[PDB]
Amino acid sequence: ETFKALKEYREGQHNDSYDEYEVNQSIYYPNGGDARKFHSNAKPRAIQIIFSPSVNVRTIKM
Amino acid sequence: ADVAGTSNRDFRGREQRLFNSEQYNYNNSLNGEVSVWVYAYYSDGSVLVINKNSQYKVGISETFKALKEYREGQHNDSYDEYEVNQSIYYPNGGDARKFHSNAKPRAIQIIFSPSVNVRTIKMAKGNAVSVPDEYLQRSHPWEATGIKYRKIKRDGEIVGYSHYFELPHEYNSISLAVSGVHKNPSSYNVGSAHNVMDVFQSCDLALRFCNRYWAELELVNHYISPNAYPYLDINNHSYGVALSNRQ
Amino acid sequence: ADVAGTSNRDFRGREQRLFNSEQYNYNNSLNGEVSVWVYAYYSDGSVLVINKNSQYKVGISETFKALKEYREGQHNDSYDEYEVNQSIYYPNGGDARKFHSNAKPRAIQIIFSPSVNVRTIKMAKGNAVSVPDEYLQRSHPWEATGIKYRKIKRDGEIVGYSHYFELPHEYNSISLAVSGVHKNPSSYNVGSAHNVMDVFQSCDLALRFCNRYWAELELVNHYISPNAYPYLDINNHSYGVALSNRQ
Amino acid sequence: ADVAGTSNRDFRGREQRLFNSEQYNYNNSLNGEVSVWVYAYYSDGSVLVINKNSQYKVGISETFKALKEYREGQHNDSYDEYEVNQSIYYPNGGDARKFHSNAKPRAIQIIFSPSVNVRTIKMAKGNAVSVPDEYLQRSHPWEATGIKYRKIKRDGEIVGYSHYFELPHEYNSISLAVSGVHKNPSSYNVGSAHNVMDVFQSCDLALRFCNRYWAELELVNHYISPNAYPYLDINNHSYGVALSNRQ
Ligand SMILES: Nc1nc2c(ncn2[C@@H]2O[C@H](COP(=O)(O)OP(=O)(O)OP(=O)(O)O)[C@@H](O)[C@H]2O)c(=O)[nH]1
Ligand SMILES: Nc1nc2c(ncn2[C@@H]2O[C@H](COP(=O)(O)OP(=O)(O)OP(=O)(O)O)[C@@H](O)[C@H]2O)c(=O)[nH]1
Ligand SMILES: Nc1nc2c(ncn2[C@@H]2O[C@H](COP(=O)(O)OP(=O)(O)OP(=O)(O)O)[C@@H](O)[C@H]2O)c(=O)[nH]1
Ligand SMILES: Nc1ncnc2c1ncn2[C@@H]1O[C@H](COP(=O)(O)OP(=O)(O)OP(=O)(O)O)[C@@H](O)[C@H]1O
Ligand SMILES: Nc1ncnc2c1ncn2[C@@H]1O[C@H](COP(=O)(O)OP(=O)(O)OP(=O)(O)O)[C@@H](O)[C@H]1O
Ligand SMILES: Nc1ncnc2c1ncn2[C@@H]1O[C@H](COP(=O)(O)OP(=O)(O)OP(=O)(O)O)[C@@H](O)[C@H]1O
Ligand SMILES: Nc1ccn([C@@H]2O[C@H](COP(=O)(O)OP(=O)(O)OP(=O)(O)O)[C@@H](O)[C@H]2O)c(=O)n1
Ligand SMILES: Nc1ccn([C@@H]2O[C@H](COP(=O)(O)OP(=O)(O)OP(=O)(O)O)[C@@H](O)[C@H]2O)c(=O)n1
Ligand SMILES: Nc1ccn([C@@H]2O[C@H](COP(=O)(O)OP(=O)(O)OP(=O)(O)O)[C@@H](O)[C@H]2O)c(=O)n1
Ligand SMILES: Nc1ccn([C@@H]2O[C@H](COP(=O)(O)OP(=O)(O)OP(=O)(O)O)[C@@H](O)[C@H]2O)c(=O)n1
Ligand SMILES: [Cl-]
Ligand SMILES: [Cl-]
Ligand SMILES: [Cl-]
Ligand SMILES: [Mg+2]
Ligand SMILES: [Mg+2]
Ligand SMILES: [Mg+2]
Ligand SMILES: [Mg+2]
């Protein structure tokens, strides 16, 4: 997934879509955007990766 | 004339030092202001500041709702946020479409000006329905929290006092009021009969300010620093201007 | 050990009774809260509650406009409601598209906590432009209405005091303020010079709460009952919790 | 110590040169990335970039619709643009209110990193319904276009490879996929049985990036240059960073 694809998207609700384009520009290059917020609450705060028991753990790559 | 910075006849230097010393001491006289600031920090990095400036005594009191982030001229999920409030006032009392409102404060910083007497500070940190301690019947209406205030210092001078507390847990849903009295080392009680109606007028004359700044950088640059206010940032850096006996 | 509920050594029972008695008496000490609630009832069955909790004395003051129903996050006919207000402030002064605004309160209930002294209660029930009695020049700024307050009782104990008045007529357009002082059977005046600056701080520390609940059932279930507040419903049923000398 | 820039003991200089040489050669080892970029140029001067970075082999495949300009958070004539698409998929098949959609790309630039083997590059430039050459039955699924790629050079070093083609005609309505394999001058086949499951994992681990920049200046300043990517602008100016045996 891309940086953008992992950001929170609320289906059928407002998502500050224009400001969030500007947020993305500021994250891709420092000072590259014109957003109206310091930190987007759509950015993930954490990630958990889980595999089923049929994986071989030594093959996992990230 | 004597040469600058070489003798006791540098009257420009003596006047500069008195000008600053007079500002510092005027603020601490009974004719001066006492000020308080409440900073509510939001997860989007914005900060609501509420300031009250008044003679003799000063304070701020806000509801749970009033401390929540409000973005002027932008969408604020206003209907869902009513439902969030209902769920915070009573568990399972609302029908919101979110587990945690990002409008709830993540932290609070209370700052007083150097003219407060720290031993007079009182705080009522209530629950979301504005009760100080679980039930009204057993609630003392405030807690004297002065002992927890840190001195904000610049060049060795106290420029203000800070109490900071984070609200990182889901159950940290508060109402808040805070109060402090202007220093008064004299035995002239400002609230005794001679002057009590002036203290009543001070309740009317207190000036309030409130605004949401987008970042702590913006708060430092355009709110704290231009007005010579004291502040303590997330990196524990102290801001303010030392005035006593200084040029 | 002795068997429960059979002797004078049931310390768990003695401690339960003291725990409740202490809450009741703490509320009535000068260290306790005094609380007031204003309930504004609307024709859609919703109820606005405004609560203020403070030491020493407490009150609420609202304009005609502020008491009108406001549905958060829903349409409120905001332009027509400005025109309604103009027509209420002066007859034929507005251009509204309705004869009677359903946002006007149909009734008001004022409740005080049991720590108030009923003889101190004062109410300023003004007209729509915030004048207590027709013209300012002849207005006394309040009326002492304590005699009209009914005791709200539970298990024989006074849990609160209620004054209720309906506003069913087209001309019942009011502004409203109410005030009460905490009981003080002592001869220590809380506002004498020794303690007057603490009363000034109490003005700053008072906590306010306001919310619109959709029904009296919802108010009873999620506002009154969870917080052990006193209430009187439309069927004259008293709500609250008796604490003095009770388990 | 010896003086800088005067002898064979300038270890800081030798380490700087090795640091750059190691980056250049690591990229070209089988442990390194192979990257491709597709730039779609629009008449409003904006540019969509799609990048894919992966080990062993890499590619991008997009539909006619996916290459059309999409302005995030702005109006995009979305209903008329569905009708435009219907008219492009079959002549006279739609009901659009425009002759030429300004969302169609005016040009395409394909760039590969210097770790690609140019002889492995393949492109499927299909029609608007995703058929490579008029009809499926007679379509070879790609064309090996390596011979047309220009070297992008900086300080005499190849920093990347470019194929550029304009789409200035009304009939230039395409779908597009492109693919290249990482250089492998060895006789260890990365897709032979020993390592083929690592190539399958590389299909999963490939990282994609896509964004629309407002101008070629902005692309150069904030996309190409900060990331040390190769690029060729409309004035035939080459961008990139030479690393082999350089300080
Ligand atoms: N711990 C706790 N406090 C609660 C709860 N519900 C309400 N509170 C209030 O939360 C306040 C304490 O909050 P915190 O100091 O942030 O929580 P903590 O458990 O002490 O944890 P840390 O301070 O983060 O180490 C109390 O004064 C209570 O009034 C609950 O579920 N747990
Ligand atoms: N009766 C009356 N009161 C008015 C009028 N305009 C304003 N008022 C105010 O209305 C208040 C009395 O209202 P109500 O008690 O609800 O009316 P009421 O005539 O006594 O009738 P009921 O109480 O329903 O039996 C007074 O205190 C006035 O300030 C008017 O046209 N008629
Ligand atoms: N010339 C032409 N090509 C068509 C037409 N319809 C579809 N095509 C496609 O267009 C491609 C060629 O496009 P271009 O190279 O841009 O056109 P060109 O006629 O060669 O003209 P220039 O390159 O501008 O000199 C072919 O590969 C076809 O698949 C049509 O009407 N005319
Ligand atoms: N209540 C006060 N108001 C104003 N200035 C004060 C007050 N108390 C002390 N000061 C002065 O402020 C300066 C700093 O003194 P302070 O006691 O805060 O520093 P410290 O002893 O180094 O640190 P700390 O006491 O915080 O551990 C001194 O000039 C002191 O005289
Ligand atoms: N001001 C007060 N505050 C608290 N408790 C009170 C007060 N006045 C009386 N009580 C107590 O409250 C209880 C009820 O007394 P109260 O006089 O209200 O009842 P009553 O005489 O049956 O009814 P009422 O007087 O309303 O006709 C008794 O325990 C009484 O001692
Ligand atoms: N496949 C390749 N990968 C990396 N470097 C290469 C490759 N082929 C040649 N080089 C090197 O790149 C540099 C430029 O050589 P190149 O043949 O591109 O230049 P040229 O002969 O001046 O121009 P051109 O061949 O494009 O007409 C030399 O150092 C050459 O050894
Ligand atoms: N940095 C920003 C953010 C917003 N806006 C303007 O504010 C409008 C509303 O903001 P937007 O980010 O699109 O939010 P919403 O409309 O509330 O939500 P959504 O678009 O996801 O439905 C936009 O159309 C845009 O014109 C802007 O000028 N600059
Ligand atoms: N718990 C919720 C939240 C929202 N909605 C519906 O979704 C609509 C849009 O949501 P709202 O919370 O009001 O957000 P915005 O309109 O996006 O923002 P704002 O109202 O602050 O301008 C509301 O009118 C309401 O009908 C709902 O039914 N239940
Ligand atoms: N007496 C009135 C009432 C309404 N209107 C017009 O009707 C529009 C809609 O009415 P409004 O009272 O504002 O109601 P809503 O938009 O439905 O609700 P709200 O504004 O509270 O969201 C207004 O903008 C105004 O132009 C008017 O001309 N005269
Ligand atoms: N060929 C077309 C183009 C537009 N419309 C009508 O015009 C409206 C507005 O056009 P649209 O193409 O959707 O553009 P915008 O709303 O301006 O932009 P977007 O939808 O991307 O936000 C559409 O809802 C549709 O009803 C139509 O009937 N036939
Ligand atoms: Cl003084
Ligand atoms: Cl007491
Ligand atoms: Cl290798
Ligand atoms: Mg939008
Ligand atoms: Mg809304
Ligand atoms: Mg309106
Ligand atoms: Mg549309």
Author numbering:
A (entry chain A): 63 to 124
B (entry chain A), C (entry chain A), D (entry chain A): 2 to 248
Sentences from the paper on this structure:
In vivo crystallization has also been reported for the recombinant expression of heterologous polyhedrin proteins in insect cells, resulting in the formation of robust intracellular crystals of the cypovirus polyhedrin proteins that recapitulate their role in the infectious cycle as a crystalline armour around infectious particles.
The best data sets for in cellulo (n = 9) and purified (n = 7) crystals were obtained by scaling the most isomorphous crystals using a total of nine and seven crystals, respectively. Based on a cutoff criterion of signal to noise decreasing to below 2.0 in the last resolution shell, the maximum resolution for each data set was 1.55 Å for the in cellulo data set and 1.90 Å for the purified crystal data set. p.i.m. is 7.5 and 17.3% for the two data sets processed at 1.90 Å resolution and collected from in cellulo and purified crystals, respectively. By contrast, the average resolution of diffracting crystals is reproducibly superior for in cellulo crystals and the resolution limit of the best data set is improved by ∼0.35 Å compared with purified crystals. Importantly, the data collected in cellulo are of higher quality than the diffraction data obtained from purified crystals.
